[PDB]
Amino acid sequence: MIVPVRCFSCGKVVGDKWESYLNLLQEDELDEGTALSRLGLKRYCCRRMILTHVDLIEKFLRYNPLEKR
Amino acid sequence: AVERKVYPSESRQRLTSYRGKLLLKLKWSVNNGEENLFEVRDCGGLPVMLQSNRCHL
């Protein structure tokens, strides 16, 4: 749903890199491998954690029971 | 009074059915056309499927 704090396999903190990954994908015209490398993700265990994240939290957040729609 | 649209989220939350009223107009014909009595009769809330032309989505 929301980005995991750490990589499952090794434990490297990858929770602070999802927004940067999106920025490097959108603003810069970087491919996914280049963006992951420039974030500091060398092991494929760490690369998959960001390369394959879905970010369903944004779709969950549109159903807000506390604000008039 | 004035009725308001109902959407299936309310039916899901109320734990009830999502159904629309069914209306048949009977023909109370007498003597092959001597006189005909017409009267629309509601026949309960007919369930409808979602995303159909009789659903509000």
Added chain:
Amino acid sequence: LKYICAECSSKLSLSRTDAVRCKDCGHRILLKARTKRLVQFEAR
């Protein structure tokens, strides 16, 4: 104010022996609001 209308999402207080409906609109579904309480957890 311990209840929220399920459609207009306006906070409303429902007294006992009172009609269960939103005061603003005509909605009969109400959601209990979560109030401030201590709830322990394990960060595991």
